[PDB]
Swiss-Prot record, chain B:
Enzyme Commission number(s) of this protein: 7.1.1.2
Biological role stated in the UniProt entry: Core subunit of the mitochondrial membrane respiratory chain NADH dehydrogenase (Complex I) which catalyzes electron transfer from NADH through the respiratory chain, using ubiquinone as an electron acceptor. Essential for the catalytic activity and assembly of complex I.
Protein name: NADH-ubiquinone oxidoreductase chain 6
Organism: Ovis aries
Signal sequence residues: none
Membrane topology, from the record: Multi-pass membrane protein
Swiss-Prot record, chain D:
Name this protein carries in UniProt: NADH-ubiquinone oxidoreductase chain 3
Any single Gene Ontology cellular-component annotation: mitochondrial inner membrane
Top-level EC class as recorded in UniProt: translocase
Membrane topology term: Multi-pass membrane protein
Stretches that traverse the bilayer: 3-23, 44-64, 73-93
Homology family: Belongs to the complex I subunit 3 family.
Biological processes, Gene Ontology terms: mitochondrial electron transport, NADH to ubiquinone
Function statement: Core subunit of the mitochondrial membrane respiratory chain NADH dehydrogenase (Complex I) which catalyzes electron transfer from NADH through the respiratory chain, using ubiquinone as an electron acceptor. Essential for the catalytic activity of complex I.
Subcellular location(s) of the protein: Mitochondrion inner membrane
Chief location bin: mitochondrion
Organism of origin: Ovis aries (Sheep)
EC identifiers of the protein: 7.1.1.2
UniProtKB/Swiss-Prot annotation, chain H:
Pfam families: NADHdh
Membrane topology classification: Multi-pass membrane protein
Cell compartments where the protein resides: Mitochondrion inner membrane
GO molecular function, one term: NADH dehydrogenase (ubiquinone) activity
Family: Belongs to the complex I subunit 1 family.
UniProt name for this protein: NADH-ubiquinone oxidoreductase chain 1
GO CC, any one term: respiratory chain complex I
Curated annotation (Swiss-Prot), chain I:
The keyword Calcium is assigned to this record: no
Membrane topology: Multi-pass membrane protein
Assembly: Core subunit of respiratory chain NADH dehydrogenase (Complex I) which is composed of 45 different subunits.
Gene behind the chain: MT-ND4L
Record flagged with keyword ATP-binding: no
Protein name as annotated: NADH-ubiquinone oxidoreductase chain 4L
Domain of life: Eukaryota
InterPro entries (UniProt xref): NADH_UbQ_OxRdtase_chain4L/K, NUOK/Mnh_C1-like
């Protein structure tokens, strides 16, 4: 009866689920298990490039805390 | 190569203007002005004018060239030596300009121009938690009162003018 | 016919967008705020004829701030001599000009 | 940069699908099928120009989410309501002089 | 002063109004031939 | 051989896709249009076979000639058939489209639509029922299923 | 005036709703008690750096530390 | 690593567009007391594959074209715009997280009329050109209320960033303060994609869709799949902008499932509208725009300007 | 100065000489005129973003709005010319020689 439309809607829902889950896992993969740094403004980009300079390995996501100072 | 990206887009911009200014038809002229508006929007976007480039795509290419193609469809039938000859003339003059300014790193067509890429002339600071261009456009309402008055009045008058002169009575 | 109605009535119709040194939103300075302020405070009141000759130095500094023609010419000279010395093999770039030095902060 | 890669990828996929849609049905060599100004409306042009002028008024109206952050809120609110009022006055004059007729 | 070139010119109209120097005819039928399908209509549209 | 197997599977693929996605251009000439509309009714429901209802006249796979063809609409029928992209198919529906029918000896009736267009399936009746028309469409799909386009291409 | 208002609400309810919503948008911020707080929040949002003053000797209203009592306060924004 | 992300956006777009045809035919089947496809696959699952293979080997139609270059460029531009409308969509993290994503989508949807206009140019008919001008005039008409309703909504957001619009709707759905904007938005997005009851070129009320005349068209499958990419995209955009879901930054798939279910319900609401109403006459939806939607749009635009000032609720800039 | 300024100026002169040399149509003239406007838009925007002069960020929008209203007025003149003469050809606009 009416539930016969549900395999097509289920396939369409999996096809809509794949881009978002995919880009969430990719942003966690390429950023050290965290969210991608959103730099919409120039101050956020300055902090981000400062992270890229202070990490030493040319990667902004390598976070350095209190262990990096004496 | 990638440091010269605004220069490459500006050469594509001049090539597109030589394209539609040769005027094969207003149809292909409109198409050439659309492609030229897209690459000039890219030029604007690569200096940091994100809102102004989206104003290109949304207002210029989004409304006005739509109305030009709309009127070209409606007031012209549905689609040479002189066109292609003036096209290759403009293309050869622009590539000779490119060749001169890349071999000398200096040129003088009317004024003097540097031959390096235009990445050299940028600022080395930040703007904080705002865009300077966005806040200057937000200043249209707070600081630009008289400018809004004359622009809105000119648009109201423009509606009145087009309804008068297209009436035919 | 410059009917100066803005000064007769005391309204600010378009004086605000006129120069870069005016009051800006969120106190944003231009890239040549100081040079333009110096040229304007030089040329104020003295007339255009006296401003062409007595404010030449501030105006040349301000035009060269705007267009950066002498600056880009000097950088062209330094970079062309650098590439010529790489061509002759009399020079090698230092490690702080090759990207292998772990930038400051 | 990532945007330019994405635009080129979308353009490339579109062009590849267009190439498939034009050349793949040219593989199956079919039969050779040998058997065997425009009228002007003023109303189409007036709806196009009314769109264009209202889109210019929209172009004035677009920095309002940024304009609401100002310190001069009396002036900003006045000029905001004044631009939307002039858009409505353009619509009212477009109404009453029979501009919105037969494409209402 | 009528010359060789400027001799074919006429004086303008006195009211400065020139003569203007028609509508669409559509051959029309029903879109999908299921209900009617066998109708031919020769329209004379006016926009 | 390997190439014969590959072209056999590719013929199976294209025949599956063509028979299972038929789009009909029905001519609603006469009473058979009512019974085609019952072949699209919710009892018989041509749309569950992939046979869509109210397809475009231009991108259709089969021209169902459903009604009485007259001498005044013979060039219109042939012009529509000339506009159809291949593979185009013709199902004749009912006796007037088959052979003139109840109006066979008339001065103004084309005696069968096979005098004008090449016909693949003949669906007989006056009117042939919606079930009989759906039988004719399924027999058309069987006729599409046993096409050998790439096998004959490989053997020429 | 109420017969015409019912007449235009019977004939053209879209335009009546349009002029009513636009009339509220015009006249209502002059009557709202919270229109003042819009200004007070927009001017108290620190987009720039609070460039300090050289302590000459007599500036009692200007604090010497952020946690000093004097200076502009945002207790009204925390409370409202 | 980023190209993998671009592909995992744009290929499931094409697969969801393929199966929206199945979902439409099945739901329009069961809403019409009948079935949709259930013979071609198990429960109809092979109907989009069969239909796409059927369309992709079909002959070019009958005629030649007036302009070959625009006949090629109009499907290219339609598909390119219909794929670039997805890249700023926060789902919960967008592919291209740009500051002006709303404005980007408004501009790239304003550019979508060039495919209609250039396909009207490329066909040899002078009547298909008139029909294309009618469709262009319809689309640019409803772009006005798209822009102004969109602006009025983003006055409660603070910026043109689409990713901020998830943060805006954490306490309430934004349809609760702006349901008149939401209902005019939904009907205007319905009228953008030439969707019923506004599909005047695909149906009657049309000078050219008239049983055996001229006008070479392009490949139907590419225009059709660009149209359904536009439909799924505008339903996702309406979902993000009025029915915003809960975002947990440690479990983003909760947001992804939630807005996916809402977007599916909204695309099914498109399917349920098209199986319910007769079409407008062309001047009747011109009337519906200019004399009905647009005065309410300007009135509510004034209200949503003046309202965060009278309530002291101006949203943050950043 | 900057190299891109040469290209935007030369684009303005290209659309100038195209506007200053008619072939047949009036629509081609209006397209060259709006290409001139486009080059003005780009060049003003590059100056204003180049100098970080904040208040003139609203200037290219005002340029765009006024000259697109100008474009609408020119298209309306073209519509009236094409309704009078049947085409938008500029050689039909020749009655003012006498
Ligand atoms: C029709 C006119 C409607 C708007 C009327 C003025 C609205 C307003 O708030 O103006 C104050 C605004 C702004 O005032 P203000 O108080 O913000 O000015 C202080 C200076 N700034 C901006 C740096 C904070 O405009 C003016 O004062 C000058 C512009 C209007 C001048 C008169 C125009 C007459 C037009 C006749 C045609
Ligand atoms: C993007 C979606 C997925 C891709 C699309 C679907 C996948 C399948 C696409 C290919 C299908 C097969 C090729 C096109 C159809 C051929 C049918 C046909 O009539 O062929 C006869 C034609 C011609 O056969 P013929 O010589 O007998 O011609 C008969 C026609 N008359 C008499 C009018 C001349 O065959 C070919 O031209 C062969 C082309 C190559 C076949 C495939 C090779 C492998 C491809 C991988
Ligand atoms: C976003 C998620 C979903 C949101 C909801 C949308 C889904 C529901 C869709 C239902 C099916 C729609 C299918 C297509 C229908 C197309 C036709 C159509 O929409 O026609 C619109 C009709 C057209 O009107 P009409 O044609 O019926 O009326 C006749 C018109 N005249 C008289 C001119 C001839 O209505 C509108 O245009 C109304 C738009 C929305 C109005 C919102 C008003 C809000 C309330 C304001 C305040 C009122 C109180 C008074 C003042 C108080 C002051 C304090
Ligand atoms: C993001 C998710 C996207 C998912 C998209 C797809 C959704 C649907 C998923 C699959 C559903 C079931 C598919 C069943 C296909 C039909 C199989 C069938 O009946 O084949 C029979 C046919 C003839 O067999 P024969 O041997 O002649 O039989 C005689 C028996 N005495 O035999 C043949 O024709 C030969 C075998 C054909 C097998 C075809 C299998 C289906 C292919 C569909 C393409 C997509 C599949 C999924 C891809 C993504 C996941 C990997
Ligand atoms: C080296 C060797 C290989 C060489 C290259 C070939 C590769 C494989 C090609 C695909 C498979 C070829 C065979 C196709 C089907 C042939 C078998 C067949 O006819 O099965 C019939 C059966 C249904 O029987 P039917 O007669 O319809 O019954 C009515 C209901 N009782 O049919 C069914 O049950 C369903 C049949 C499904 C067919 C397969 C699924 C479609 C193809 C998927 C991949 C291609 C498309 C990719 C995506 C396209 C765009 C979306
Ligand atoms: C001052 C407030 C702000 C005002 C400016 C902002 C307005 C925002 C909305 C934009 C409206 C734009 C278009 C306005 C056009 C008005 C003229 C008009 O439409 O007149 C024609 C109409 C009769 O329609 P008809 O010609 O028959 O068309 C066929 C459709 N069935 O005629 C009518 O139906 C009569 C229309 C006028 C009467 C409406 C009265 C509404 C009263 C509501 C309560 C009071 C609201 C407060 C404001 C005071 C209003 C006087
Ligand atoms: C007939 C011809 C072919 C037709 C088919 C193909 C063309 C049509 C479809 C493609 C349309 C392309 C639109 C590209 C511009 C979109 C605006 C844009 O770039 O916005 C994103 C972003 C601004 O956002 P924001 O976050 O503020 O900036 C980043 C700071 N964190 O800004 C950025 O990220 C800027 C990135 C660098 C600049 C790239 C600009 C695009 C490349 C040049 C133009 C190419 C297209 C030319 C033709 C377009 C159609 C007219
Ligand atoms: C002097 C200033 C310009 C310098 C460059 C000249 C390029 C070569 C053109 C020389 C003149 C050619 C000519 O006859 O142009 C006339 C033509 C309009 O005439 P048409 O209607 O095509 O047919 C009658 C044939 N004369 O007019 C056109 O075709 C107009 C084409 C204008 C496009 C200019 C493109 C850039 C040219 C180089 C930069 C300046
Ligand atoms: C890439 C995948 C392409 C799938 C194409 C599916 C086309 C839709 C099939 C049925 C159909 C519907 C619903 C439809 O609405 C329509 O327009 C009236 C058609 O064209 C005549 C159709 O054929
Ligand atoms: S075969 Fe008979 S019943 Fe059928 S359409 Fe003809 S006249 Fe009518």
């Amino acid at each position: 009866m009416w539930f016969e439309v549900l395999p097509g809607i289920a396939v369409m829902g999996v096809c809509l689920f794949i881009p978002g889950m995919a880009t969430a896992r990719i942003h966690r993969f390429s950023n050290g298990g965290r969210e991608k740094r959103v730099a919409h403004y120039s101050y956020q980009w300055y902090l981000m490039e400062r992270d890229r300079r202070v990490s030493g390995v040319n990667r902004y996501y390598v976070s350095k805390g209190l262990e990096n100072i004496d | 190569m990638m440091t010269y990206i605004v220069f490459i887009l500006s050469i594509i911009f001049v090539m597109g203007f030589v394209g539609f200014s040769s005027k094969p038809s207003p149809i292909y002229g409109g198409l050439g002005l659309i492609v030229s508006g897209g690459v000039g929007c890219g030029i604007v976007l690569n200096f940091g004018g994100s809102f102004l480039g989206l104003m290109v795509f949304l207002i210029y290419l989004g409304g006005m060239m739509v109305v030009f193609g709309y009127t070209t469809a409606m007031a012209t039938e549905q689609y040479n030596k002189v066109v292609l000859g003036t096209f290759i003339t403009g293309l050869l003059m622009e590539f000779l300009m490119v060749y001169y300014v890349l071999k000398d790193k200096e040129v003088e067509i009317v004024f003097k121009f540097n031959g390096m890429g235009d990445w050299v002339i940028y600022d080395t600071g930040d703007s904080g938690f705002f865009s300077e261009e966005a806040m200057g456009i937000a200043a249209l309402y707070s600081y630009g009162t008289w400018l809004v008055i004359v622009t809105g009045w000119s648009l109201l008058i423009g509606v009145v003018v087009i309804m008068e002169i297209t009436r035919g009575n | 016919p410059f009917f100066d109605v803005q000064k007769k009535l005391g309204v600010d119709l378009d004086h605000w967008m006129t120069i870069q040194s005016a009051e800006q939103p969120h106190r944003i300075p231009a890239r040549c705020h100081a040079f333009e302020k110096e040229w304007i405070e030089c040329a104020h009141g003295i007339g255009s004829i006296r401003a062409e000759k007595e404010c030449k130095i501030e105006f040349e500094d301000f035009r060269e701030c705007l267009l950066r023609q002498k600056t880009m010419k000097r950088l062209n000279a330094i970079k062309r001599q650098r590439d010529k010395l790489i061509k002759e093999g009399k020079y090698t770039p230092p490690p702080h000009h090759s990207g292998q030095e772990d930038l400051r902060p | 940069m990532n945007l330019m890669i994405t635009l080129l990828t979308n353009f490339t996929l579109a062009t590849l699908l267009v190439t498939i849609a034009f050349w793949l049905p040219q593989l199956n060599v079919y039969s050779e099928k040998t058997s065997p100004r425009l009228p002007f409306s003023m109303k189409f042009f007036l709806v196009a120009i009314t769109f264009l002028l209202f889109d210019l008024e929209i172009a004035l109206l677009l920095p309002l989410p940024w304009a609401s952050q100002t310190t001069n809120l009396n002036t900003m609110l006045t000029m905001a309501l004044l631009l939307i009022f002039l858009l409505a006055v353009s619509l009212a004059y477009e109404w009453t002089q029979k501009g919105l007729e037969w494409t209402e | 002063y009528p010359t060789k070139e400027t001799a074919h010119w006429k004086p303008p109209p006195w009211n400065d109004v020139d003569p203007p120097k028609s509508n669409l005819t559509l051959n029309f039928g029903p879109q999908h031939p299921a209900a009617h399908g066998v109708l031919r209509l020769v329209m004379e549209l006016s926009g | 051989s390997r190439g014969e197997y590959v072209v056999a599977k590719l013929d199976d693929l294209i025949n599956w896709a063509r028979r299972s996605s038929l789009w009909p251009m029905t001519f609603g000439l006469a009473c058979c249009a009512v019974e085609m509309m019952h072949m699209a009714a919710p009892r018989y429901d041509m749309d569950r076979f992939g046979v869509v209802f109210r397809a475009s006249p231009r991108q259709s796979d089969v021209m169902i000639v459903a009604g009485t063809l007259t001498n005044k609409m013979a060039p219109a029928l042939r012009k529509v058939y000339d506009q159809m992209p291949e593979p185009r198919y013709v199902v004749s529906m009912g006796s007037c489209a088959n052979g003139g029918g109840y109006y066979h000896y008339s001065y103004s009736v084309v005696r069968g639509c096979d005098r004008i267009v090449p016909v693949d399936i003949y669906v007989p009746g006056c009117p042939p029922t919606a079930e009989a028309l759906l039988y004719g469409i399924l027999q058309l799909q069987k006729k599409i299923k046993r096409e050998k386009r790439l096998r004959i291409w490989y053997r020429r | 005036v109420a017969a015409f208002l019912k007449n235009v609400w019977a004939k053209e309810p879209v335009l009546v709703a349009s002029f009513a919503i636009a009339g509220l948008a015009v006249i209502l911020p002059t009557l709202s008690p919270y229109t003042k707080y819009s200004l007070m929040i927009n001017r108290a949002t620190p987009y720039n750096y609070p460039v300090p003053l050289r302590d000459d000797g007599n500036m009692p209203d200007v604090p010497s530390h952020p946690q000093d009592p004097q200076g502009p306060s945002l207790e009204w924004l925390k409370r409202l | 690593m980023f190209m993998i992300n671009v592909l995992t956006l744009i290929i499931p777009i094409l697969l969801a567009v393929a199966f929206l045809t199945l979902v439409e035919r099945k739901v329009l089947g069961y809403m019409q007391f009948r079935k949709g496809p259930n013979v071609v696959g198990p429960y109809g699952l092979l109907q989009p594959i069969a239909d796409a293979i059927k369309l992709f080997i079909k002959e070019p139609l009958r005629p030649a074209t007036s302009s070959i270059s625009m006949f090629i460029l109009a499907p290219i531009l339609a598909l390119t715009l219909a794929l670039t409308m997805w890249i700023p969509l926060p789902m919960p993290y967008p592919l291209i997280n740009m500051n002006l994503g709303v404005l980007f989508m408004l501009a790239m949807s304003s550019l979508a009329v060039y495919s209609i206009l250039w396909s009207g140019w490329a066909s040899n008919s002078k009547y298909a050109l008139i029909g294309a001008l009618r469709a262009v005039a319809q689309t640019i008409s409803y772009e006005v209320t798209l822009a102004i309703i969109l602006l009025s909504v983003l006055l409660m957001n603070g910026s043109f960033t689409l990713s901020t619009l998830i943060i805006t709707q954490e306490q309430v759905w934004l349809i609760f303060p702006a349901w008149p904007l939401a209902m005019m938005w939904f009907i205007s997005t319905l009228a953008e994609t030439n969707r019923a009851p506004f599909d005047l070129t695909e149906g009657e009320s049309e000078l050219v869709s008239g049983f055996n005349v001229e006008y070479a068209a392009g490949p139907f499958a590419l225009f059709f799949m660009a149209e359904y990419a536009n439909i799924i995209m505008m339903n996702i955009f309406t979902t993000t902008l009025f029915l915003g879901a809960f975002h947990n930054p440690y479990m983003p798939e909760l947001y992804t499932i939630n807005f996916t279910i809402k977007s599916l319900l909204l695309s099914i609401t498109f399917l349920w509208i098209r199986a319910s109403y007769p079409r407008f006459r062309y001047d009747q939806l011109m009337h519906l725009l200019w004399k009905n939607f647009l005065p309410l749009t300007l009135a509510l635009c004034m209200w949503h300007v003046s309202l965060p000032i009278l309530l002291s609720s101006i949203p943050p800039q950043t | 100065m900057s190299l891109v300024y040469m290209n935007i100026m030369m684009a303005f002169t290209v659309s100038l000489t195209g506007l200053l040399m008619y072939r047949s149509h009036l629509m081609s003239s209006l397209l060259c005129l709006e290409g001139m406007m486009l080059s003005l838009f780009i060049l003003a925007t590059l100056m204003i973003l180049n100098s970080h002069f904040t208040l003139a960020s609203m200037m290219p929008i005002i340029l765009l709005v006024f000259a697109a209203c100008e474009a609408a007025l020119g298209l309306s003149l073209l519509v009236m010319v094409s309704n009078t003469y049947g085409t938008d050809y500029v050689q039909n606009l020749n009655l003012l020689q006498c």
